[PDB]
Amino acid sequence: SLRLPQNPNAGLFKQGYNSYSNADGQIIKSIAAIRELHQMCLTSMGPCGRNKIIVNHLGKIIITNDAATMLRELDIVHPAVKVLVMATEQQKIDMGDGTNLVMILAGELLNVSEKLISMGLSAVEIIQGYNMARKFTLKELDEMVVGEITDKNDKNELLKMIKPVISSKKYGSEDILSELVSEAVSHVLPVAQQAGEIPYFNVDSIRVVKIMGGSLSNSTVIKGMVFNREPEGHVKSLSEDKKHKVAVFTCPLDIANTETKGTVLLHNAQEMLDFSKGEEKQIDAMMKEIADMGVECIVAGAGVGELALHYLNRYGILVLKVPSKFELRRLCRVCGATPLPRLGAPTPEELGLVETVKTMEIGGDRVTVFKQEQGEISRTSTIILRGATQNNLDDIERAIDDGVAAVKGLMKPSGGKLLPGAGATEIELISRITKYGERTPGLLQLAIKQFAVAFEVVPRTLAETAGLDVNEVLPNLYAAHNVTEPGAVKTDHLYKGVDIDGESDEGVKDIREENIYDMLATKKFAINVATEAATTVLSIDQIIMAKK
Template identity: 60%
Template structure:
């Protein structure tokens, strides 16, 4: 018998439906082009004057934002190489809150410049090695460009140096108001003895439609956008004991089914009255322990609510386990999985519980006494007011980024000049160092330096400036400052306000700074993502599980068609 050899490559190796793309098919070039496409998409959203994008996700929800992390999170990207860049950007946003767009733009520019070198004949490994050498050099020397530090985290002016530029990148024009809200919230939860114990989850945002951003406020405690279930809506007798229950406030059902045989009406009355007496005994026991406020993490039955109202309890139902965790932190209570009177160490205490009407919404506020120095809340709430839902969502994202940037500040308080200033200085220094390196690696090092130009160029383009002219002025200003003593240098960046004719401004005088640790992390993550994409020479994709994907318009019973 003759042996039948497969005619096509990989024939019979994989199941039917597999697709493969090798380096011979131009897989590397196609990966680079896909990454460059996503980079160009978000590059116009970088900086204070970045353009907004309208994103309609798979559920039909509309997002209007210039926040790269939100844009990438809502896009249903399927290309595996692009997903590597998105994962790096998400990691930066989760860790430090800022520079998520920087990673996509810089990694896309690195890959774009590497495509030119691949055409010239350089191998991917030579480019990767050159990029890694350049990245190591930047990590070692980025500290040299430090121009300021946040010396005191409890000083409003010191924190403003960091928070204001981060917020301005998302909410340009409103950065002053939003930054003050963030700083007030941070100072209300920051531990003077151990500032490094700061937790991002300690600050919560509640959005209430109506009024304007100027009427936003910070509450030292928790705000729930709902009323209590009980008749009593507030407590103002000073320190009030609180109990938090995660179990249903109801008569417990047995695991086994049972049958009750009733012979007459009197037995039925006795049965129900016995149940009511049992419920009243439980409520009376809780009341005798001193508790006056009950937080229910699950359902509250009508009969229980009747007796809780009878004894004058404030009952608030909280459906979110994360909010339960926060309210336990505010009150100092322990969540109880059993129904009954809590032990003294399981109770919490709160100074004020009140129900207020903010706009057209009624909210319940749990707050500590701000005049009492010993009554420090472990959670603060920022109440944000605004005209539209999309505007409130965008303000919330800016607040989240500003709060997350404080995590990096507690690790390293060094600040770099912003607005593209440090990138221009890095380009000059890195190019001069790359020219001294032997062989073809200097081409990759120079390409790495040239890729940093994408940040000031994008800032100039989004601000409506002539990018070529602005970059020339930045290079000239940076070169002129190299001969000046380090402590007397003026650091020039892109003037997004267009106050100067040459398009550049002294960023330290304007208070535009970047956090050193955030910039280091962003450059390192972008380099790792780009080199990972370059190291791929084949893509092997299995057949997608499930049936064929049906477009929304073709689905039976579509609501859009019915309308």
């Protein structure tokens, strides 16, 4: 009576092991545990979304509203939350778009599931309700698609793709951020129309260089790569033009050394007198063949000795240091050169072409300009990003990567397949699934009808973060979808969406004039990952933890 039996025969497992099952409201606590980090990403959704500050154990601060990036530095405890954490990371890697949608959609499916479990629905019937409703959801997305990107590159068409994606990440000015990203995309495209070749694109081609100081309006697009380097011998503006011939060596420039027990052997004083002048003639003979080919610049991948740098300054040859690997790999893609390990005369067919190499002060340090010109086009262009704070420079770099990943969505599928934006995609699916829930007899209609209710978070989040009442604005939007379709065709009511601030009362007419759209390839995987993330949590009846 004084002390409990304290769960007898509990010594079967270590004291650190704990057992949590769907019974005793723990499945409700798991859903309630999602709402703790769910509201964190709700205020970050949309162009009016709010960025968050997360301080790690090392002191690094990353300010971003992206749900996939924020969950990286955070330490997660509850096991089912890691299901939601790792689900948002896959969406960022695969499609590079729709990261905040997976975080919000998977969290709302568990919120509506709390009422489903309370009514007595078994975990098996709840899973079957979402799987049957998701298959109908993916089929309706292909029916509601409007427009297409058609040609690969266009000045106007690239403003309907990258611009609406970068509007949510660091909104700021619209046309300023859209022109910087859209310019670097046109350079890495092979074009070559009418040839019938298979298009190709690389998401790592465009590199963002973070340089503090200045302003966003002073940013520009550089066709070449930009590094922080100090020329050793001399600096040259290279005003003599006629372009240049450049060679790249992944191996360092120095006398070849034996990999085992390199040692100077001198038997007599006769060999010692010619040893000092012997090494000078070796580099002279090797560097003379390079200077005879007209090579004004040499790219090195490791440390170069001083004896090798002497003859390079004699013929006026620039010296570049390219540490590690990936930095040197993208240099040859600009000039179209093939590295070779030997120090001999390079092949003329493997030499690159760079017209000008300039060194100027941007952020206070000397940077080398690899920028290309109209002719002899180059690939893997870089974008100079100027900003006052380094924290803004980090997320804008990821904001540009979101636009670069959107270009990848123009390659694998048949086209761009633009979808109505401003939340109009998830709202139209509500009326279609509602009719789908009635067409299916049985008890499975409870999970199907509530599956469309979870799509109401998109219009409510955009309206709440915009400083508007969700009770006045949201029902007024259904008035366009409550009139169904008339006796005549050409119905433009599908373009209605949620507006931020302004005059409220729905607004922005039809979004076709706003030019903001969504990607179909993004919404396909965003719904599948978010559904499986909530399905995994609902499919686990018992959770076991260790040490805590």
